[PDB]
Design a protein around this ligand. Structure first.
Ligand SMILES: CCCCCCCCCCCCCC(=O)CSCCNC(=O)CCNC(=O)[C@H](O)C(C)(C)COP(=O)(O)OP(=O)(O)OC[C@H]1O[C@@H](n2cnc3c(N)ncnc32)[C@H](O)[C@@H]1OP(=O)(O)O
Ligand SMILES: NCCCCCCCCCC(=O)N[C@@H](CO)C(=O)N[C@@H](CCCCN)C(=O)NCCC1CCCCC1
Ligand SMILES: [Cl-]
Ligand SMILES: [Mg+2]
Length: 384
């Protein structure tokens, strides 16, 4: 059952809506009526507002997620967002410090839970709505299944509603009421022997080690020869190319110029964006973010270096050629695997480019919004 989720303005498990339905579960909400008081925590635990711009607070969030964040279904790989990744993820334009909420255990003064949101304009089925994007919900492994997570959820909802914002977008690997879409992850091996060693991949009695290395070999030469790291001059051209491209989709972020600068200007070991400029015009782009996983219980390796497909647009090449070059640039940047969801145009190139189907899928959710669900080809946004 979903005893907490049932109490929320989200679809029931059997709710099915027509294409023409595109509206809040609960309208005419009033900032005036929102609770002013912080939700109650169990005895000896306290809210804490985290300053992600302070290196020590940001270290505390980092340590909590390194120890306690999401794993694969077999508990071998744990997401290991870097501290600098977290700074970038949480400091987007017009972010609110008061949306970065920790919970401390009073007796140790240590952070045991966290939840965050950033503001984002989201276009769902051709209506743009101010939303919050919720991410990084984490409770310490030692305090699980004590119903802390609905306290964290209800508290960020209250803070977000104080800002006159009544919809949110979030993603999870767990099934919850009720996905507006569901995208499988696919994986394109780069460092094959490592991936075998750590049990990310496997060999069969058809594939020997040398065969598997040969299969995934790539030519160190770009299809689009001028693709280069994006520069601050490129920001308006990226904004034009990406903004135009994204409008075809059922669900996508509407980016200002300033969000473009934030979300794409490269930061080593965090975000990589490459552009093809022609005539002072940006005609193609490739982006991917770095998200390592800590490898649990492997004597030889501690970390799996992984690049995640972000936003990719081509006007002068094929999309296969574009994504071939995205794999190469990730190889050039020392990544072991290139990961992508079956969103946008991506699935169309998976078989050709030797991506393998994963064992997880990422569900997309909206809070307080009622709409038809859609196939993930129609999803045009990637959350972190
Ligand atoms: C308008 C503004 C709106 C703002 C708010 C919008 C919504 C934002 C929602 C958040 C979006 C975050 C997106 C995001 O960060 C990306 S998805 C990743 C979330 N993080 C992890 O998976 C970290 C590893 N696990 C944990 O820390 C814990 O297991 C957590 C904290 C997840 C659950 O802690 P726990 O100790 O295992 O459980 P209880 O405390 O006993 O709580 C049980 C209740 O929590 C429901 N639950 C479990 N996992 C959930 C999940 N991933 N989303 C939503 N709900 C989730 C569960 O169904 C149950 O409710 P139910 O009885 O109805 O079934
Ligand atoms: N919601 C925001 C973020 C948090 C939610 C994120 C939810 C996802 C959490 C992590 C997760 O399950 N990853 C999956 C996605 O497939 C994953 O890596 N599988 C890998 C490793 C499986 C390890 C064993 N079990 C996987 O299949 N390799 C197969 C690779 C292979 C390459 C060669 C060709 C065939 C397949
Ligand atoms: Cl080259
Ligand atoms: Mg709990």
């Amino acid at each position: 059952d979903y005893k907490f989720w049932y109490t929320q303005p989200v679809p029931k498990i059997n709710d099915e809506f027509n294409e023409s339905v595109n509206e809040p579960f609960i309208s005419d909400n009033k900032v005036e009526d929102v609770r002013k008081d912080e939700y109650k925590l169990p005895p000896g635990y306290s809210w804490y507002v985290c300053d992600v711009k302070d290196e020590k607070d940001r270290s505390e969030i980092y340590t909590l997620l390194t120890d306690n964040y999401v794993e694969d279904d077999d508990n071998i790989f744990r997401f290991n967002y870097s501290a600098e990744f977290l700074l970038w993820a949480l400091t987007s334009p017009n972010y609110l410090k008061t949306w970065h909420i920790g919970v401390k255990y009073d007796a140790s003064n240590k952070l045991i839970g966290f939840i965050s949101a950033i503001p984002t304009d989201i276009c769902i089925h051709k209506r743009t709505i101010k939303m919050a994007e919720v991410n990084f919900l984490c409770v310490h492994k030692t305090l699980r299944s004590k119903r802390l997570a609905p306290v964290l959820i209800k508290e960020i909802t209250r803070r977000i509603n104080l800002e006159n914002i009544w919809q949110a977008i979030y993603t999870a690997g767990v099934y919850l009421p009720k996905p507006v879409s569901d995208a499988r992850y696919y994986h394109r091996s780069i460092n094959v022997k490592k991936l075998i060693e750590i049990g990310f991949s496997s060999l069969n009695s058809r594939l020997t080690m040398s065969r598997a290395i040969k299969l995934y070999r790539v030519e160190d030469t770009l299809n689009i020869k001028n693709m280069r790291l994006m520069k601050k001059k490129d920001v308006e051209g990226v904004h034009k190319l990406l903004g135009s491209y994204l409008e075809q989709f059922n669900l996508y972020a509407v980016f200002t110029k300033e969000e473009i600068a934030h979300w794409f200007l490269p930061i080593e070991n965090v975000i990589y964006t490459y552009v093809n400029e022609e005539n002072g015009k940006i005609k193609d782009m490739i982006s991917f973010y770095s998200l390592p996983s800590q490898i649990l219980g492997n004597d030889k390796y501690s970390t799996l270096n992984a690049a995640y497909s972000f936003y990719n647009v081509t006007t002068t090449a094929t999309f296969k050629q574009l994504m071939q070059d995205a794999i190469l640039l990730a190889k050039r940047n020392n990544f072991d695997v290139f990961n992508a969801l079956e969103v946008m145009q991506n699935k169309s190139v998976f078989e050709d480019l030797k991506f393998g189907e994963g064992d997880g899928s990422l569900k997309y959710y909206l809070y307080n919004w009622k709409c038809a669900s859609f196939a993930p080809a129609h999803v045009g946004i990637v959350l972190l």
